[PDB]
Design a protein around this ligand. Structure first.
Ligand SMILES: Nc1ncnc2c1ncn2[C@@H]1O[C@H](COP(=O)(O)OP(=O)(O)O)[C@@H](O)[C@H]1O
Ligand SMILES: Nc1ncnc2c1ncn2[C@@H]1O[C@H](COP(=O)(O)OP(=O)(O)O)[C@@H](O)[C@H]1O
Ligand SMILES: [Mg+2]
Ligand SMILES: [Mg+2]
Ligand SMILES: [Zn+2]
Ligand SMILES: [Zn+2]
Lengths: 420, 420
């Protein structure tokens, strides 16, 4: 049934969910949507209809042949206005993955791609100053780290839009992205055209990187650093006299070096402070509605209670924190509004990189937090909890270790933010 | 349309731009030129005409077959008086790169090659004395480092012209260059003739290097050190009893060793101070017009303002600095005249190389700046800012870290230059 798939994709585009999960059991099938990170239950339908939608989704993709069969792992992709019937204009590509599930069941996951105040998107002012400092530098490599849900592409787009204006259009910027999802002024995104099979995608990505290096690159923005060859090419370009802005998957701002050593980057490449200009780690959390703004007493009287760690976090400022209001008001659909970025930005020095390269993780963290006046993800999350922008539960679900901050550090951060 | 291409190349030769960029969108195409490093907007035309010029440029190259197709990365080269119709005599070769850009768009970059007081080309007198000292030495390897825009080939040409006169024509000099772009007296440039495909160019370069080594080389000037095999051959020739002058791509004068270790040079080759005779890092900046010479007060009254870091740099000498005059006077076309070299020259010792090999970057830099009386790029840029030759904005765009110089170092440099 193509009509059911059309309405399902229309609903997914209208509510702007990220990924769509369909689990088909022997009796009934469940539909889940990943909207703003959290997963919600959309609908529950019969198994035969869901099997029909899954077959229609697989048959309409660009992976024709290797027909739809149960108990098989199958990957596919649907391109808008290119793959048979048309798609909503907000969606460019849908990546489909089919997994077996039990006996007589299926598991489909569709990852949608969307076409889609400039100074701060929830950043701290220290992060903005650090961003300006790294934008002023003409030579170096910058790595943006975080999960797939965080706003890395938007951050890079905004940084390059600011940098193009700041340079008075006297510099050339070249970006390499396999999907040209975000339009950036004066950047000339280079797509990957002859992708062919999935195994040949990396070779064409390397070819695009080398072609961009044979150009006048100056500033380079690859979409993602995935394998060792692309990272080696980027590090070679960084020691040549080019500026590189890249995205990486990592758990921490200081854990970027672990990923680079996993890929194969040598120690003398990571030792230079002039090369590795900046490291950014990002997470996205939900912003509480500023109009409802119920307090801790109202949340306790309504129902529910906080745990011991949440109480320990709250204990510094009781009345300053706010909690979500599930009253279904007209101002907020669910009370969670949009989303904010919690981030940490590090500008390395010689001593910090020497401490990192020697394996002294605790010493390097102490040097960054004390001598360099740094701020981690947990401290920014605690500050946003105290300010009342976000809830404690979402922060402790996204970031761990908020309760481990000492009282002296909390007082120092509060005094530093109140003085400025 | 071949006529439009002919006038475009005539304009590019007449204004002597370095590279030419053409970006073709769905509606209109933009033409950019890289003149004196900065990029300027030449013209805006329609998409069909620009596509016609791009097709005519690709078809007239030496890469016939593999016809001009959209969404494909294509490399080509045009040789003057050899590739079908003739070219201006000032241009030898034009390297063409074609990249996809969006849907129904293209991106062409053409890199022109040109045919093209002897003691200083903007150098400091310490750099001239160091150059004389390295020219007097009969055995060693010298590496010139910098970006592709800096004047490395001209510096090597001038150094070899001075050295041939200083040696009273009692020595043999052999140079290896793939383009024989610069004519040097008594040097006998060896070109690469049977280049065939682009992948076979390195093998013929190695063959030319080995043929030059089978000659009486004495002093050798390869065009560029690109791969590990050529660098290994040059290091083998340096330990044999030959003098090597080479060009390398690097970010810093002391960062040459990082590139050499990346290529595969062992530690005992880099430890010897008698082998690595000198290291030079070069940048090119724009020279302010000496006739207009407006001050800081005139620049402030005309419009615009300097930032906090620029004010911190200026604060030592307010009236000594000068700013560009955009009055469109008859003496200067744009107020930026020609270009000057900001460079750093290091003559290594045993202790400095031992500190570099042990990974002590800060200790090696301190030893070079204090014990060896060295001068970095930032200090030379600051001295040229104070003298009034160049503007602070161009220097801070080209070189970072000018504001990090301490007041004691600034006073020491000013007193040292005023005493001599
Ligand atoms: N303040 C915000 N900052 C970043 N992203 C936001 C923000 N608010 C909403 N979003 C949404 O987060 C989503 C994910 O960001 P994205 O640019 O796609 O990064 P990534 O490529 O790593 O997934 C975006 O679609 C964006 O619309
Ligand atoms: N004082 C100067 N020193 C060096 N180059 C200069 C100077 N003034 C103008 N130029 C120009 O800089 C351009 C680049 O120098 P070049 O010899 O080509 O080095 P490279 O081979 O690394 O590009 C030259 O074409 C030269 O005409
Ligand atoms: Mg992304
Ligand atoms: Mg050269
Ligand atoms: Zn509300
Ligand atoms: Zn003038």
């Amino acid at each position: 049934v193509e009509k059911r798939a059309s309405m399902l994709l229309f609903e997914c585009a209208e509510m702007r969910v990220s990924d769509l999960h369909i689990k088909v059991y022997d009796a009934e099938a469940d539909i889940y949507i990943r909207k703003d990170g959290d997963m919600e239950l959309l609908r529950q339908i019969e198994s035969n209809t869901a099997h029909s939608i899954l077959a229609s989704l697989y048959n309409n993709a660009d992976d024709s042949d290797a027909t739809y069969k149960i108990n098989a792992y199958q990957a596919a992709r649907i391109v808008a206005s290119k793959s048979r019937l048309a798609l909503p204009p907000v969606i460019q590509a849908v990546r489909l993955q089919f997994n077996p599930l039990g006996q007589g069941g299926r598991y489909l996951i569709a990852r949608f791609l969307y076409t889609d105040d400039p100074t701060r998107f929830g950043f701290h002012h220290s992060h903005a100053e650090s961003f300006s400092r790294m934008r002023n530098l003409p030579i170096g490599i910058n790595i943006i780290s975080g999960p797939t849900g965080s706003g890395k592409s938007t951050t890079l787009k905004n940084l390059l839009e600011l940098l193009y204006i700041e340079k008075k259009k006297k510099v050339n910027i070249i970006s390499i992205e396999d999907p040209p999802e975000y339009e950036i002024d004066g950047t000339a995104q280079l797509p990957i055209t002859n992708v062919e099979t999935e195994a040949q995608r990396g070779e064409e990505y390397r070819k695009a990187i080398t072609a961009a290096l044979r150009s006048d690159p100056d500033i380079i923005m690859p979409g993602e650093a995935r394998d060792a060859e692309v990272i080696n090419l980027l590090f070679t370009a960084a020691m040549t006299g080019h500026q590189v802005w890249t995205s990486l998957h990592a758990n921490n701002a200081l854990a970027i070096f672990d990923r680079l050593k996993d890929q194969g980057v040598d120690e003398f490449k990571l030792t230079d402070p002039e090369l590795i200009t900046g490291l950014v780690a990002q997470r996205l959390v939900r912003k509480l509605c500023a109009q409802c703004s119920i307090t801790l007493t109202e949340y306790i009287a309504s129902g529910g209670g906080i745990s011991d760690t949440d109480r320990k976090i709250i204990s510094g400022h009781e009345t300053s924190v706010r909690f979500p209001n599930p009253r279904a008001k007209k101002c907020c659909r669910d009370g969670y509004n949009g989303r904010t970025i919690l981030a940490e930005v590090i500008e390395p020095d010689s001593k910090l990189l020497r401490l990192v390269a020697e394996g002294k993780r605790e010493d390097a963290q102490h040097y960054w937090l004390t001598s360099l006046h740094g701020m981690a993800l947990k401290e920014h999350a605690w500050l946003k909890i105290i300010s009342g922008e976000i809830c404690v539960m979402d922060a402790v679900n996204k970031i761990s270790g908020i309760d481990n901050i000492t009282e002296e550090r909390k007082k120092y951060l509060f005094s530093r933010d109140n003085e400025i």
